[model samples]
Every structure is written in C-alpha cells, then in structure tokens.
Target: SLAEIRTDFNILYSMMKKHEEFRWMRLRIRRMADAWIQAIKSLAEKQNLEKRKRKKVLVHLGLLTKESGFKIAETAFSGGPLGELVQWSDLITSLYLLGHDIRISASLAELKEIMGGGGVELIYIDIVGLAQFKKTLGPSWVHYQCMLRVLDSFGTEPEFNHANYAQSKGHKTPWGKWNLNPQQFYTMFPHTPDNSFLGFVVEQHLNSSDIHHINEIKRQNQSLVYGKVDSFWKNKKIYLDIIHTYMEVHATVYGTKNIPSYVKNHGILSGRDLQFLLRETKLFVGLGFPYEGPAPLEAIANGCAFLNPKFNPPKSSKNTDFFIGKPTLRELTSQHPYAEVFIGRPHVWTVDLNNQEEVEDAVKAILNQKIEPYMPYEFTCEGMLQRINAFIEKQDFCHGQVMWPPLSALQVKLAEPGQSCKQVCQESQLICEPSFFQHLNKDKDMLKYKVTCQSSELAKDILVPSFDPKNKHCVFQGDLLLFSCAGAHPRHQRVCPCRDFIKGQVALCKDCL
Candidate 1:
C-alpha cells in the first residue's frame, strides 16, 4: 500500500513537471514537498540529515527532467483567472501571427516559436538505432489538441485520436475505479432523469436552509447531505437548527477540509487538482463566491457530479428588475450556453434551486452511484493547442507567399469615407477628415462647414434659445440668430451661455448653459 501510494505520488510529481514550466513547476514541487514534510512531521520528528536527504532527492529527480535542455513551450498568454482559464481569443490570435506551423507540428517547438522565435525541434533515436528529427516535442495532448484545431476541423474522425487521451491513469483508484451501472436505479419522479444530484461543498456552515423557502424543503427531503468542512462558522446558532435537522434526518455528512491551501486560496481548483479530486469526489458543492468558471470544468472533467444553485440573474441595475432580477426556471436553464456546448459530453450536471424535491433526488442518486467521465468538448489546453496549430497551417497554406499590399493603399481601402459638408450638416456627424481638427480654417464659411448647422443649431437651441428678442418664450426660429461671430464668442470657445439660466435676474446669462 505504501509503495502504491509512493508510486502514485511519483506519477503526480512527474506529470506536474511535464505539464508546467519552471515557475509553476518549482512552486508546485515546493508546496507538495512542504505538504508531505508537514504531514510527516505531524506524525514524528525527523533529523536534519533526513530532511536534507529528502529535499535532495526531490530536487534531483522531481525538479529536473532527463532532457536537460528542455524548456517550457510558450503557447499563449491571458489576463485574469477567467481569461487565463478560457485562453481568450487574443491568445489564439497571437499564436497564429507568430509563424509557427501548428497544423503539421503542433508541439512545444511550435509553441516556443509562437511565443518567441527560435529554431527548435525534437530529436530522439528511433527503434532501429537511427537518429530521427521531429518537428516538435511534447505530450500527445500537446501535439493533438493543444497545438492544432483537431476537434473543430476533424471532429470524431479516424485521424483524431480523442479516445487515446481519455484513458484514466492507472494510479488513481479511489473514485476513478468505480464502475457505474446506469440502469439499476429507478428514476426519481417529478424530476427529470437529467436533474439528478445537488451537492453542497462549503467551508462556512451558514443556515443556508433557513434563508427562505429552503427550510421547508429540508423537512420534506431526507436525502440532502450537508457536508461541513471547517469548524462551524462563528454564528453557530443561526445555522445550528438546520445543521442538526439535516444531520439527524437526512444523514448530513462531515469531512476534513483537506483541500490544499493553494486551491482553497484560489477558491476553485485548477484543472490538475480537479482531475485528482474527481478521482474520489462524486459531486463538487460550494457556496456561491470564489468561483465562476473553472469550477464547472473541474466538475465536468471528472464526469457529471456538480451541483450549483441557480444564481438570480444579475439585475440590470441595483434597482431595475429587467435584466437578471428574477429569472424563471426556463430562462435560467437557457442562459447557460455552455451546457449545450458540453451536452453529450456527460460532464456537467446543472440543478435549479427552485425545485426542492428535484434537487434532493439528484443528490441522492449521485451519492448512491457513479457516473461516466466527461471530457470537455472545448476550452481545454488540448483544444487551445489544436486551434493554434490549425490556424498556422491554414495561414501557411493560404497566404504564406502573397505579398501584402502597400500600407498607404491598404489604409485607403480600410479608411472611413470622408464626410461632405451637406452630409455632416444633415446628420450632425462631426468629420475630422485629416484625423485631427487643426486642418480646418477659422473663417466664417469654413467655420460653418466645420461646425455643421445641426451642431450649431443644437448649441444655439440649448444656450441662446432660438427665441427672437421681439418674441420670447423659447422659439427655435427668427432673428435670435445664435452666432459665434468671431470664434471669440464664449460658445465658440466651448463655454455655453445657458449655464446660469436658472438665476432669476440674469436673463440668458453666459453661465447658464
């Protein structure tokens, strides 16, 4: 058992190094070593030599790869956790522009090129004792999906080996080993076969059940399992009754919050951690904050054991109820565009908090049995690589040799049409033909052309109301000729005369508008 555990740890360590660069690799290794050291030290004290020896072993084997000169492949860069997780379109665009042949090679070398140009390739002796040169080097996923858009281009074809990477690593046995018999159990009624489980994973033991109508559901359903991680929150009484009731009647469970600080700190688990956790975890449950995107994928990666409450659609404004104020069940279901994107994948399971019985039934079933593993159809490292490679290949095939047109000609073709004085006057659209307004002359005719009649009319109507001095009461016509005679006029200088209009005594003051 100890040997098996050690082997598993070794595999995880090896994979970690292979997947990440030096920065992440070093940090992960250190954290993992610290975790082990703390775990061991908690059990018994170790001599300085022993600690040093352990650290040395980790450094020698865990930190460095046999391929001494190997460097991380820089494929793409993204901002923010969500952006990084999604590997936004900007990253794809950057990779495509960098002259890396993704379609053919789609490997670390290509990624390196996309990030920074360099002549790099993989070299290894063949089975027949002959040296062979490869276009790129990296894991199969890197070659197949990460570097090329295989899924989009090929879908499920013979050349695209989707199944090859789907096999579970032999080392993870706890939850990964379980075989689910999809037909044995009876489907819960009034709940769709799809609406199966609702699990809550939270550190805070708040009286979530007592918040509104959930308390009533707790009484009806005995299947709800309230898992408490940390010591109950400070306001224990507020949730105490619900906790006791759920635990007593529904067999609410409790487990050590054994999640690593790195994961807890980030709020949501990374792809690697999600895979590992999913090995044993049936469904991921959590209170609403600290997560938004990655958690869904993490749950989906391990196969359909995720339960999240239907968040009230975000309101249009703090006061308005139009946009997301109170979303109906159907609206809530329709809003998750990704669900359809991941539909047949069998990875994501969504639940509406509006239906208590359905939520309880789903939770019961998920706990009682297991589900199949579901890999995402898109937005994965493999998918990103594939897309990059495909784009590079297309670019090379289509326009690699075509000389681009001259910048001046290209600018003329792409530039906006110059506005005529008539069009500008009618449309009230300001046109700075030279890209700046300094080219226009200050003469009356030029000024009239520059400031369209509509614009001047707008200024006049607002500031010097078009009321004739002879006839008052805000008229938009007659001799109230609102004029900026010399550009010396306050209106021409960008100061309106109507700003002080509210002052009772000053009739049409310069400070009014």
Candidate 2:
C-alpha cells in the first residue's frame, strides 16, 4: 500500500526507490514496527495527521541519512524560530532522535557535491521546500497556511476562514461591524485627578500653514482642542522640514512672545503614557502621511476625539505633488469608521490643511464637545495574544496524532571494501569489458566516477538511466564539451582521451546517445 501511495507521488516514489540502501532500511524498520507503526496509524485516522506526519518524517529521514555522512541544506530567515529550525541545536537534536548522521550545506552546489562525493545523503532547504513539503505533510499544513492569511487580513473572510473558524469562535469583536463601548470595557484604567497627562505623551507643533489656519480661528475667538499627530517621519525630508519649521515657529510664538499660544509641546509619549494624556485631553488630531495606513487607531482606542484630514488620491501628473498629493483627508477618515464610532456624534472632525479658517473651526468644534474616553476590550494586547495562541494550539494538537512508520529499523550501508572494479562489476552482473575497466581508471583530469551497486548485481546490472539532455542539462554546456574532448581533466590531472570519453561524456556521448 505504501509503495502504491509512493507511485502516486513522484517525490515520494523517488525517495523510496532511488536510494536502495534507504529503501531497504525503511523495510527493516517496518519489520520491527511496534510503537512507531501504532503512532503513525493513529495519526492517519485523524484529519490533521498529514501535517504532523510530514514534519516528523522529514526530521526522521534527515537525521538517519546524515548519520551515514549525507549532507543537508537548511535555509534561515528573520523571525519565527529561525535559529532553532536551521541551526546546530535543532538539526543535531533531530538527528540524534532519528539515528542519522548528516552534514549541513548552505548552497545547492555544495549539496550536489556532498551527494556525489558520498559525504551526505540528506538536505533540508527552508522556504524552498515549504510548499511541496506541506503537501506531503498533509492537511494540518494547509490549516497553518490559512492561519497566516487570517493574521494578515486582520481576520477578514476567505483570507481568515471567517465563517468556519474566526466568527463561530467569538474572536471577531475587534474588527467587527458593531461599535465598541470603552467606558464599560476599560474600567480597570480608572480616571486620574491630575490635570497633567501621564506615561509617554506625544508632543508636536504644527507648521506655518497649520498655524496660519489655527490663528484665524483664534482671531474668531474659537476654542482650541488638544490633539495627537500620527504621521511617520522616518526618511521623508519634506515631513521633517515641516516638523522643524513647526517647532521653530511654536517656540517663537508661545515661548518668546508669551501671547496666548495656539499650540503647545507635550513631548514624546506612547502606550500607557499616551493613554494617560488622552484621559486628560478632549480631542486628538492627525496629520496623516502619504500612502500611510492606520496608526490613529491607537488614539481612538484611548477615547480621544479624533480629527484627521480627509485624504484624496493625487491627480495623474508627471510632476510630484507634496502633501496635497497624499490621500485626501476624507479618504483617511472613512477608511476606519470603527475608530469614530465611540466618540459620540461628530467623532471624526475633518479640516483642510491649506485652509486656516476651516482648520481653526474644526479644532474649536472638537474642544467644545464633551468628549469621553473610549476603550474596546477586543483591541487590547491580551485579547489578540490569547486569540492567536488558541488558534496555534488547536492546530498543533490536531496535528500531533499523525502516524508514520519508524525509521530505526531501516538498514543503511555503503559498498563493500577493497573489491576490484572489474570483480565488483562482474559479481554485480554488469558488463565488465576490459576497455570499460580501462576507461574507468584512465587519467582524465576533468572527469571522475564512483561505482555503487546493489549486493545482488554485478557491474553490468548497474542501471544507468537513459540520458535525458533536458533533465541533466548544465549551464556550462560548451565548457563541458571542450573539457570532455581536449582539455585536461582537473580531477585526474591527466590528458587521457579514454578517461574523458568514459567518465566525462559517457552519459551523453555518441554511443550512449
């Protein structure tokens, strides 16, 4: 049955058939079956077993092959337990558990060399094998892939498997359609008596355009409200320039002139610090960045009334537009309507950055409103962590019961010692002509050969598969031809044509062709 199953999958068939010693070894393990067989059988009964079984199989095979001097390729990338997956610790641990010896190679060429040189028998290349490996591993693998998509979409359907998993399980509150009530939810963070904001609070000064706009409102005697800035300044020179100009003007207008200031600097605050400030503040303002996504969600979560520019996409023009070219303030506001739901009526106050009068009026409207603090339970860090952990745990448990045969009983061996090439060939029932022997041992510098045969067969019985140029094609075709014909063989450091024809071109030469 296993052989039949292997036939259906090319990769599995290759694994079971190509390495004679490995196949024989697997049969031996089957004969000694017992616990491994039971464990694998139990796994097979479960829907999630495919995922778990594949991981175990690969780990087991990888170890056994390594013990026999086979090399494996392992790739690592940033994050996600990369160190343990590809490093010395996990590899050695897996090998010791499975009773295999293997060397680790980082490159494809190195893996080929080790396989050819008889130095290594297994290689695990990360990411490269993720897709196919999952197919072999089964359904649990498919589930894991689905979970990643869920996280990326913030729990949307198809991507998140919403109907079957996310929604039916009661984990859909955060991004759900309903408005969240913060007062009843975040009762733990009680209101403080201090007028000054606590923890890390963000302090920002508005630029000349912002000031001119705000000043007009001040002239009209409109009330000014406190707000937070959400734009990322990281390498954008224009944004930085605006910030610098804002700070300079703020210092001159408020610090130097001492007239009633339009804006004040509170300093950099994040997390709990921002929360503390929000409790004391009535409104939050956001000057959004171009092509930027959500960050104002943080301020909204803290129950601060949010004021953002309505962003519109820039016109299709050859010349670049600066701030105006960014998303129109309206686009930014509508994208996250959930953020506005808790701020009572007119939660999202919009203003035109270029219009001084409108900016001041919007600010005044927000300050005059009786804004309340908002905190939704589902958006908390603890809630997200608990939800994600539960998903991973469920998948892991479901996958743990998969069944596969044991590898310990497998018999692995190399060619016997000291047998002459001709004798070995004859005993293996392979064609042992004197010219073939001569060619094999000739002094070609560019070509090399190793004879490995099943114990029951002689040299002629060694079945070298038919040459398929497409399959064995090399990038250096010209070099291979030249080296096989006239150039000195590098391995042998000699100029013998017999060796070249036999070793270098035997697979693709006229006779073989």
Candidate 3:
C-alpha cells in the first residue's frame, strides 16, 4: 500500500496521526500513494515496462556547495530561498526512497574523480555548476557525447539556451550560458522548448469534506492581495498604486526580514500556516517579478482565488529593453502561467491594467465570487512519484530517444520537401499534433507499428533535438510547434489545448493517464 511506501514515513508518524484532520489527510495521502503504486505495478507487469536496473549515482551540489567558491550565502538569487532546500530535501528523500545508491559530491575535485572514474550516473542538482565546470575542465573533458554514464539535470533554470536567458552576456563568465541539450536537462516548468520536465508537487490533496469545512470558514474573507514591491516589474508602482486605491493589501517581504511596526504582518510562515493564511485571505496577487511558482497554487488549493496582471503583449529576452541578464527567456503571460492557463475562471482572475473597468471587474470578481479547492493529480504525491520514476527508469542521455516535446526524426520527416517540419502534410489539412510525431512512418499513416523514414540525412538532427529555426517552418518559439497550429499569428501560436482532460478535473491532459 502507498501508506507503507511513504517516502518520509518515520517523519509522518511523528507529525500527524493523533490529530483528526491532519491524521486523515496523512492517511489519505498514504492510500492514494498505494493505489497509484498498484496501478504502476500492474501496468509494469502487463506491458513489461522494463528499464535498466537501478544506478549508483554521484550527485553534485556545486554552486550550492560551499567549497565551490561560487557558493554565495542565501539571497533572493533566483527564486525565493527557504523552500529551495525543502524542495531538494524532498527530491533527495524521494530519489533515495525510490531505490538507488546515491552519493553526494560538493567539490569539483570529487565530481571530476567520479566522472573520470566512470561506471556511475552523475546527476547535477542544478545548472549552476555547468558553466563553471565547463570553463575549468574544458568542454572535451566534461562533454557527455562519448561517455556511457548519464548526466542528468534537475532545476528550474529556464530551458538552457541563448534565447532562454542572458542575451547580452555572449558566453561571458558570470552569465556563462549553456545551450543545454534536452536529454541532459530537466526543468520544473513545462513551458519550454528544450529540456524534459520534472515538475514540483504544487498542492496538497484535501478531500471534499476537508474542502467544504475549510471553504466554510472564510476567516480572511476580505479582498487583501499579497505581493512584494520589486523593480524588475516595468510599471510596478502604477499597478500597485491602483491596487492600493481599490483592493486591500498587506505586502510581504522576502527571505524573512524586519517588520514595520503597526503593519498586520505575518513575517515568515511555515508551509502549513501559509496554506491556512491563503485560505483565510481573499487573493494571492503577484508583483510580476517572481513569475510562475508554488505560491499561487497554494492560494488556490486553499480555496482563495488569485489575482495577477495580464501581460497581453508578453515579455521575452528578444524584445527586452527591460532587465537584462535575468535567468529566463520564456515569455511572461502573467505572474503564474499554470494558474492562468491550467486553472482559470473561479480559481484565477487575470487583470488587464490598461483597462480600468477590466481591472475593477477582475478585482470585484475575485472578491465577490466563491471558488472551490482544486489540486491537480500531477501535483499529487503519487503523480510526482510516477513522473520521477518514469524519468529515472526511462531517461538516459547516453541512449534511447529524447523524452520531451515527445518527438523523433520520423515526425519531422512527415514535412514536405523545403517545408519546415511545421508543415507536415496530412490526409485533408496540414495540422500535426506533437504526439502524432511519436507514431510517424514511411508509407504508413496510423497503424500498429510506426515505420520511420530510412533516409539518414535529417535523422541525425532528429535523435538530438535542434532549434535551427533559420531554415524556418516547424520551430517552437516557447513550447508550441510554430506552423502546426491553426493560428496565423506568429506570437500567439502556442495553446495548451486538451482534447480530453480527466472528467471532473481539468488540470491534466488525456495523456496524463
């Protein structure tokens, strides 16, 4: 059962069980974990979802390592600071619990020794060490092309390309950018052209009873928005000033700081307490700097709607007269995209600041309407385990097909000559689903076995994913296949259209099963 398979079992035993709601929630998590485990086991047996045996991994914590010299004290470096550990901690525990022999490396010396020594998987905790490592060791010594051992990355550091971040740095140090290959790179966010996704567990699964009981207690029912004042935002003061005029706001400080007396301040909150506070509050607003993250999910899961400014004309590195040398190149639709795209309507209220009435209406809607709790299956413990295990079992930079964008050379070959892969011919119209690429063939359309093109010309680029959009046609700006979609506009081509979501829950795609 999942209860018995719990990663932090001993920890949970001490924390919950005695309390009623806490105990029930813990038990429920355990039950769900078990059920998902059974499903996986059953499928594994039926289909023989065989992967290589477990590995002995050397885990590098370079920039995070104090000895790396690159290690700086905790600041608002990338994302917020505190939960970064808790994030990695759960990851560490999960990896360990999932059955693998994992060793830790804090220094380049140790990493070098392991890499040179061979026979073990080398996993980077983040992209921080990559540039520094390459600079010190030279690309030849550290490159994964010849190596049999896998080099896996787990981080939220964009998609690891020139377009992703650091447009002005020009391969310069400090902003030493890596055009990371997707097989070797895994991101926490799904909105990227490159890298495989290893998403975070966004929210806790509260049962309907728990949901109803919590929603009934509207303690923090007033329309107060939680945001920080940051200059990274273009028109911060303008939107904030407007919000101040209409909505109630008790602003927050980051990484824990001194509180201004007389302010109704909740300085630094524990995860549990923070969820409760989000439940009490009316909305979790964004400053637009610390864009997509777990906070909005926390607010929504706790039955509070989120309000954020809409970036209709999305901001990206290409058109940036704004903040240069930031850590991302993805366009900003709003502060939290998963909130805006996946869970909208009652859960999220995206305001257009340009229109005063729209802004006013969004704020009013957030305040007036009622929204129920929502937690996606993917964000659940079982789902996290499923994805983590899938990556662990199937992910190999050394072998097999690339796992993201979920495509192949055969998929790209479907395109007519001189036509970019975006214009792959179909029976009636010219439309291609990224998934349809996985099932491409030579003379076959949709049959049992996908017969790929025998031609070797473009197949080289297919195995290793490329973004050579210079040839044009089938290129992804962000996550969207540019020419495939119906929209003629180049900018707004991407849409996460789901053919069918989990019946009641709209957060997951049909493929999530």
Best by lDDT: 3
- In model 3, how large is the Cα lDDT of residue 429? 26
Residue lDDT tens for model 3, 1-513: 111222344554343343332332343334344444444454444433343366666665554555555423243232244334334433444454455555555567766776677666546455555544565457664455322222222222322243433343342223324444333454544443233445555544355576777646655434444543333334555555555555555544443222223225454454555555676666666666565656677677778778766877886656654424444444667766767866788888877767777766776666667658776655554455556665665555555545422332122332222332323222222223333333332223322332232221222122111222233222223332211211122321111111222332222233432
User: What's the CA error at residue 151 for candidate 1, in Å?
Assistant: 20
Backbone clashes in model 1: 29
RMSD of each: 26.0, 29.1, 9.0
Q: lDDT of each structure?
A: 0.25, 0.27, 0.46
RMSD of 3: 9.0
Candidate 3 — worst ten consecutive residues by lDDT sum?
480-489
Model 1 C-alpha lDDT per residue in residues 49-123, reported as the tens digit of each score:
122101000011111232433222232111112212122122222232222221221234433343333322211
* Candidate number that wins on lDDT, 2 or 3: 3
RMSD (CA, angstroms), candidate 2: 29.1
Arranged by TM-score, best first? 3, 1, 2
Weakest 10 consecutive residues, lDDT, candidate 1? Answer: 53-62
**Model 3: CA > 4 A from native:** 1-52, 67-87, 109-118, 132-180, 203-209, 223-247, 254-263, 321-329, 400-513
| Per-residue alpha-carbon lDDT of candidate 2 for residues 259-318, written as tens digits (9 for 90 to 100) | 223345544342234344444444554444322223344444433456555434421112
